[model samples]
Target: SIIRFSVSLQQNLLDELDNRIIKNGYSSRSELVRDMIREKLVEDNWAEDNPNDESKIAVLVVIYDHHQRELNQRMIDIQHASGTHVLCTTHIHMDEHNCLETIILQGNSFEIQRLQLEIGGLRGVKFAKLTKASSFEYN
Candidate 1:
């Protein structure tokens, strides 16, 4: 069953939402908000799962300076210690100085998030994001 509720918002915020609706080709604000809420719920579920289990899966995408001293080695070492198996990795040389790498990891959500935080916090990394996946049915 779908429950309807009233949401109060400032005129500027409503205008922004309208802009997003048109720009993103969303049919309505409700549709867009539903997806936004679902995304947050997935993230919350991942955070709530255990750390050492072998069932969780996540992908970490990071952009960094490959030339940074020992940074590559440090990332490898961290992944090695996390106990999460690296399924595969793809590297793209973005420019003379920057490189983009996508590392697929399967293991516990907690540990994966921990590794993401560590790698994202590293000095040479410019951008990092983790995409979480699950085997269970969400609906």
Candidate 2:
């Protein structure tokens, strides 16, 4: 079921909305608005990971100095004890000293956020970002 309602916006914002509609090939403003709303919901859920929360799925991307002493084993150890389920991990050799890895995790939001923080705080990890996703059940 869908409920239709009117949304009022200033002229310039409406113009920009129409411009994005064309740029993104959105069939109508409604389609684009629906996605924007859903994305915001996902973002808010991730932001609320500041404390204990519901289950979630997130991909943690990390760039680290590959030569850091015993870093690989330490990362593996952290993930193993994180209480989250590891879906998979892909590692790429970025250059002589840098390596990038993506780890997909599924579990409670608190645990996942903790795991991400721990990994990012490692001695050799220069960059870490967590991209969150959810089922959009609240919608």
Candidate 3:
């Protein structure tokens, strides 16, 4: 059974929501709402490690300057650690200096978390974003 609930939003907020719904090709607000909820659920489940769960996989999309001193060696250290497995890394030269690398890691949550902290703290990294998921759930 579907429960009916009432929620209120300002007209201005609702207007922006409508724009996003249309832009993303969502048929209706209800459909988009359901999807948004499910997306949050996935984030929560993967963040909280379960004893019965398998190892998690995470993709770290990193943007950095190639010319930064000793940055490559620092990043290599993080990738070469034993706790996590660097499944594969694809690097794209965004320009004469900047580079974007997508590094896929498979291991425990803490292991993956440390890699993010190390790379993210580097001065060379212009930007870094992490997307994580449990291998079991994904399979």
Candidate 4:
């Protein structure tokens, strides 16, 4: 069974939602809202999981300047020592100096967040974002 509820939103917020729907190709507001709810649920699950065990997974997306001395090697070293399996990494040369990379990691939530923080703090890294995920049975 599907339950329907009404939400009150400011006109500006509604306009923003409409713009996002068109920009992201969402079929309907319900579909977008469902996904948003799922994302929050996932985040809550990740936050509530065991902190000291290797049971959570995440992907860290980072962007940095490739020319920064030893920055790439430092990132590799940190990942190796993070107690997580780096499933894979994909890199794209964004321009003459900048590069973007997505690192897939599997480990405990605490550990993954720690790794992301460490990498995000690196001298040359301009941006870093981690998306938490979990095994299929997590929920």
lDDT of 2: 0.86
Tens digits of per-residue lDDT for model 4, 1-139 = 5799998999999888877775677888877887788788788878787867786768899999998889989998998888888889999999978999998888988778889999999998999999887564355
**Residue-by-residue lDDT tens digits, candidate 3, 39-113:** 787677667876444367889999999877899998998778737888899999999789999999887777777
Model 2 regions lying over 4 Å from their true place: 1-5, 11-35, 46-55, 137-139
TM-score of each: 0.80, 0.70, 0.76, 0.78
Better of 2 and 3 by TM-score: 3
- By TM-score rank, best first, the candidates go 1, 4, 3, 2
Write down the lDDT of every candidate, Cα atoms only.
Answer: 0.86, 0.86, 0.81, 0.86
RMSD of each: 3.3, 3.7, 3.8, 3.1
- The reply for model 3, stretches above 4 Å from the true place, is 1-16, 50-54, 135-137
Off by over 4 Å in 4: 1-20, 136-139
The collision pairs in model 3 are none
What TM-score, to 2 decimals, does candidate 4 have? 0.78
Displacement of the residue 33 alpha carbon in candidate 2, Å: 4.7
Query: Which candidate gets the maximum TM-score versus the true structure?
Result: 1
